[PDB]
Each structure stands twice: as C-alpha cells, then as structure tokens.
C-alpha cells in the first residue's frame, strides 16, 4: 500500500479517469445515466438560456457572455492549455461564482452552474470557489446535491468533515458548522476572506448593497454563535478576528459595519481584555463613527457596551476630542437614555469635560 499511497497522493484532477470515458458523467440537474446521453450542444443551450434569464434580473452579468458563455469557451478544454490560461480561467470562474452566489436558489443560476460543471469540471478544479458560493445555503437540498458532486472521501482532505451530508443526503446542521468554525481556525479564516473578497468585488457597482444581504447575514450569524459555543476564547481567535474587525470598521457598507458591531459586542461580553486593546478598539469605533450617518446610534450604543463590561479606566483621553465633535451627540444620547442606561459613557466623559473646560 506504500506504492498505493504514493499513487493516490500523486493523483491530480488533470489525469482523472472520467476525462477519458463516458461511462459516468457528473451533473447537478440529472442522474448520471441520463447525463451521459447529453451532447455538448444541449448543455451549451441550457447554459445560454440560464444566462439570458439571469441578464433580465441583473444586468451586470453581461461581462460573462464572452469568456465563459461563447463559442471560444465552448471549444476550450482546460487540460490542453498551460497553467497561466488555467489561472486566468480560475479568476474568471471565481468572479462569476461570486456574482452567482446571491441568485443560487433560482433555476437560471442552477442551469449556469450545470453548464460550468459540464464544460470546465469546476467540481475538480475549483472546489473552494464552489463551496464558498454554496455555503450560505447549507440548509437546502440543492446544497446537498452540490456536495454530492464533490469527492471528499479521504480523511486528510480539507473538506472531509462534509462527508456525512454526502453519504446520507441530509442538509448540514448549523451546530456542526459552528463547532467546526470555532475549533478549526482555517474555516473561520476562509469565511472572513470570502466575505472581504465578495465585499470588495461588489463595491464597484453602485446600488449593489442588497446583493450582499444574505451572505453578510450568514457572516453575522455564525461567528457570533461560534463565540457563544467556545468554552474559552483563546488569544488565537481574537488575533485572527482583529484584522477583519478593522476592515469592517473601515468599510462603508452598512450591513458589514453592523456585523462588525455584533462581533465586537459579543467579544466584549465574553472575554476580559487588556487596557491597550480596549483603548485601540474604542479609538477605532469613535474615529470612524460619522462615515455612515444611519449607523451612528448603534455604534454609540456599541461603545456603551464596550465601556460597561470592561475595566472602568480602560479607555484613555486621546479619542475624547473626536467623540465630542460628532453632530448632535447629546440628542442621540438622550434618545438612547429614554430606554436604556447610559451611565458608563457619562462616567467616562465628565472628568475629561471639566478638565477641558
């Protein structure tokens, strides 16, 4: 089996057996027996029909007509071309899957995904991109089909923990997702990197905030729950989370800032923090408050939480001027005061206010 282990480690998607025979064909829409009786023209027609339907709902797909849904893509087969061509194809497929992710529950997206699987074998070459595209819909059955397309049998594979949902045909449970998220840091880094990349891609198009809704909600749903599930939050988790927290604070998307606020609130509730890190977090919250005028109040309330569950003298005097210069500060503070306690913020403010006067 030493020769067998060497051979199975030497295996590559380029030298797959299914490339050289038509006994079995992988298909998202059809069983393999019927899928082995489909000509390339029929699959191309289904993909073009799906893309044409998708163009009506969202225009910005037109750029994918030429590289992926044309005659040149029809004739092209990846194994024949060099690594640079495959890398460019990987970039194009990743961009198209990022665009597809909001519409995955719709049928035209399924047709386009079927054409991509038939022509480019993305289940072998682009496993990570496909998983990133389909992950926020893990409670659905089409997710189970997409997982069943992949081969994850090896216990040393990255996606081995997704094996039972392939074997039993059941959706992934959220508790397992949370446990693997907090215990395995690579999965959390994958989720954060996917969120940042999708936000950066969708930033260019004006009026595209809605397209990022569900994914961002998923980003809000798991991480906080992961912080709930962990018995003790080690310094590794916070060290990994902090750059993404800063990126969320620096962004202009309301939902991304809201998810960052929830993550910050949960972290402040659960773990005790050194004075320096509380100071830096409060400085970053105060300095970037006024960028989004619709998220002022929550941000201020978030600061209150950070100033209520930590040591009283954690915060310094440096962010005090920028805190005072926000428009209508006392009116928002009074509006919050009508329902909730605002004592920590005034407790911080008054000794600095008298000295500054």
């Amino acid at each position: 089996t030493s020769l067998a282990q060497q051979l199975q480690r030497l295996a590559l998607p380029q030298s797959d057996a299914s490339l050289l025979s038509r006994d079995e064909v992988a298909s998202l829409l059809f069983d393999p027996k019927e899928a082995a009786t489909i000509d390339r023209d029929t699959a191309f027609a289904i993909g073009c029909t799906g893309l044409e339907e998708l163009l009506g709902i969202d225009p910005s797909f037109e750029q994918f007509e030429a590289p992926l849904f044309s005659q040149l893509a029809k004739t092209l087969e990846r194994s024949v071309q060099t690594k640079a061509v495959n890398k460019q194809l990987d970039e194009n497929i990743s961009l198209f899957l990022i665009h597809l992710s909001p519409y995955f529950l719709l049928k035209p997206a399924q047709k386009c995904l079927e054409w991509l699987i038939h022509r480019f074998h993305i289940h072998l070459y682009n496993q990570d991109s496909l998983i990133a595209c389909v992950l926020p819909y893990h409670e659905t059955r089409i997710f189970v089909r997409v997982i069943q397309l992949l081969k994850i049998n090896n216990s040393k594979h990255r996606w081995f923990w997704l094996l039972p949902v392939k074997q039993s045909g059941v959706p992934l449970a959220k508790g397992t997702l949370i446990t693997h998220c907090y215990k395995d840091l690579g999965f959390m880094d994958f989720i954060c990197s996917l969120v940042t990349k999708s936000v950066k891609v969708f930033a260019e198009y004006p009026g595209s905030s809605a397209q990022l809704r569900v994914l961002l909600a998923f980003y809000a749903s798991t991480i906080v729950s992961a912080l709930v599930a962990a018995e003790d939050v080690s310094d590794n988790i916070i060290a990994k989370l902090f750059p993404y927290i800063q990126k969320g604070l620096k962004s202009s998307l309301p939902d991304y800032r809201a998810a960052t606020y929830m993550i910050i609130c949960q972290i402040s509730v659960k773990v005790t923090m050194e004075n320096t890190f509380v100071n830096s977090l409060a400085s970053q919250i105060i300095k970037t408050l006024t960028k989004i005028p619709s998220l002022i109040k929550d941000g201020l309330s978030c600061l209150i939480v950070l100033l209520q569950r930590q040591k009283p003298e954690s915060l310094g005097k440096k962010p005090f001027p920028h805190l005072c210069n926000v428009p209508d500060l006392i009116t928002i503070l009074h509006g919050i005061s009508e329902t909730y306690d605002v004592s920590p913020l005034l407790h911080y403010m008054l000794p600095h206010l008298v000295v500054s006067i």
């Binding site: 395995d184 840091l185 690579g186 880094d189 990994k240 750059p243």
Partner: protein, 346 residues
C-alpha cells in the same frame, strides 16, 4: 550546507571541541569531526569545506572529519568567519579583519577598525555584489566596503540601537537588519530606503531567515526562546511560536524552496518545524535531543557494555549507546497517573 555530487542538504552543529553533520532528510549522523585543543567559538561553511575557530587560531576541515589547512597570525579571539570564494575573512575581538587565501594560507589583506568608533558585530556579503561586504557595528553605523579596491564605498548612519544580525533577503538589493531593541529593519542598500519595520519586545535579534517556497514569511529569533513570524506582503505579524527552545535561540534557517525551519539551542536539541497545518501553525516534525539539564547519576548497564544509563535534573532517564547514536533511547519522565498524560500530553 549544500553538497556537490549529492543533491542533498547537510546541517552541521558544534559539539564542544568537535562538530557533527546530519542529513536534513532524516536527521541521520553522517560524520564526526576530529577534536581541536580549544572549544570552538565560531563556525562557517562554504560547501567544499567547514571552517572552525578556537582561541586565536582557526582551521579548515575537509571531508567533515580532518583538518587540511590551519591559519595562524591572530592575537585575539575570532567571532566572525565569512567564506569569500577561494578566500576566507576572519574578524578578531580587538578589531582586526584579515582576508586569507585558503590553500596557500597567505594573508591577502589586513584591515583595522577603531574599537571605540567602530566595533564589528555583524558581517554580510550581499549576493550578486562584486567583492563587496557589509559591516555592522554595536554603535549602530553600517559601512559598505570593497575588498579588491580596499576603499570605503559608503557609510550608512543607521540607527542608534546597534546591529546584531545581518541577513540577505530574497531580493537583489535588500537586506534585513536586526537591532538590540528587538527591531527588524528591511532596507535597500543601493538607494537607502527602508521598506518596512518589525518590532518584538523579547530582546535583541538573534537570527533572521526568509521563506522562499512561494510564501513571503520572515522569522526572527529571541533570547527568550520565542520565534516571531512576520508577513512581508501585508507587513503584519502572522503568528508566534512560544517556547520553541527552553534556552536562547542560536540559529534558525528556512530550507531553500521548502516549508521547513531548522532550529537549535543551548538545551542540547536540534529540531525541524514544518508549516503545513491550517493557518500556518508550525508543528514539530523531527528532532535529535539529549539531556537538557546537568547530569546527576550515570552507571553502566549490561555486561556487554554498549549502553550507559544516565539521569539528569530534567526528570528523565535515558540510555546512551557507546557504539552508535542510532541505538540511543529515552525512558521518559517520572510520572504518576500515566493515563492522564495520554489525554493532555506532557
């Protein structure tokens, strides 16, 4: 050290009055050198030979076992050895720098530096530079010299802390400078700009290595025994390896085009680290280790006499073979409730 006629890398560690050579593939001993009268203070390797310094005299070793050339003419202890083609550069304690031809053993050039003004604490020969060496000082200044012309090309004002380490970055004109304060400075010596700065609060920079397997990662050691991993691309801290060695880190090097790190220390341990886990978590791959604490009791075991049982202050019992080190074995630590140790580790 890389080898000719054998596409393999060898690591050489100083052991008292001798040195040992191991293949990096499996950490198997391949040679043991002859003894020298004094303890070895500095070592260097140039592929063909191994250079060792003891007292005020240094010699060259061939076949990793025997001396073929010895060099006399220094009145103080040597701390630095720089192989330069067919020539060798030696730096004394008082401040004498002499270039010697290895085979003929004659002195090519003699240079002196004022101890108060410029005491050499680090030496580096940048790659693709014709007859050029870089000199660092405890005062904090850097001098670029040309051996052939025997003139000072340029003087870098540097920083007031003082230089402890010099390392060639994977670039034509970029070097890494370590400071006593714990600060690593990435500098371009041709046009005099600093690309980026990193700081660790663990003491002076012991050694710096660069990962060249396609990932821009830099590692710097500390006297506390900790190693910091920095991302050159994003200018941030990736992760920190705490207590890699109990004692101070002596030397750390990434294998060329490999995700492997080779570290040794004063705790009588040579270890290999592989960065293949998720999120770049280094893990122990291979190690060759002996007692890390002074011995308490040693007794011969067996009438055949090929093994000796030894006990140390680290709480371990070990057996050392007298014929070959492949038969060395360890009996472990003294532990009640061994089944709990399985669950949580040592």
């Amino acid at each position: 050290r890389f080898s000719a006629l054998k596409r393999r890398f060898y690591v050489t560690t100083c052991v008292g009055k001798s040195f040992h050579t191991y293949d990096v593939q499996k950490l198997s001993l391949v040679a043991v050198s002859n003894s020298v009268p004094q303890d070895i203070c500095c070592m260097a390797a140039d592929g063909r030979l191994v250079f060792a310094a003891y007292g005020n005299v240094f010699s060259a070793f061939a076949r990793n076992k025997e001396i073929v050339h010895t060099f006399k003419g220094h009145k103080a202890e040597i701390h630095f050895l720089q192989p330069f083609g067919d020539h060798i550069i030696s730096v004394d304690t008082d401040g004498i720098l002499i270039i010697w031809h290895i085979y003929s053993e004659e002195e090519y050039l003699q240079l002196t530096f004022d101890k108060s003004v410029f005491k050499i604490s680090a030496i580096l020969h940048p790659s693709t530079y014709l007859n050029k060496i870089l000199l660092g000082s405890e005062q904090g200044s850097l001098q670029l010299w040309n051996v052939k012309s025997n003139k000072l090309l340029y003087t870098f004002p540097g920083w007031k802390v003082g230089v402890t380490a010099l390392q060639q970055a994977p670039a034509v004109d970029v070097v890494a400078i370590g400071l006593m304060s714990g600060q690593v400075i990435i500098h371009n010596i041709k046009f005099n700009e600093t690309l980026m700065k990193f700081r660790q609060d663990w003491g002076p920079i012991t050694s710096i290595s660069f990962r060249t397997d396609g990932h821009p990662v830099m590692a710097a050691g500390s006297p506390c025994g900790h190693i910091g991993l920095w991302d050159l691309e994003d200018k941030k801290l990736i992760n920190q390896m705490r207590n890699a060695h109990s004692t101070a880190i002596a030397g750390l090097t990434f294998l060329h085009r490999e995700p492997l790190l080779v570290t040794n220390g004063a705790d009588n341990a040579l270890r290999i680290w592989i960065f293949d886990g998720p999120t770049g978590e280094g893990r122990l791959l291979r190690f060759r280790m002996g007692h890390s604490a002074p011995l308490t009791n040693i007794r011969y075991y067996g009438q055949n006499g090929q093994q000796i049982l030894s006990a140390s202050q680290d709480g371990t019992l070990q057996s050392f073979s007298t014929v070959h080190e492949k038969f060395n074995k360890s009996l472990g630590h003294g532990l009640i409730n061994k089944k709990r140790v399985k669950r949580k580790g040592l």
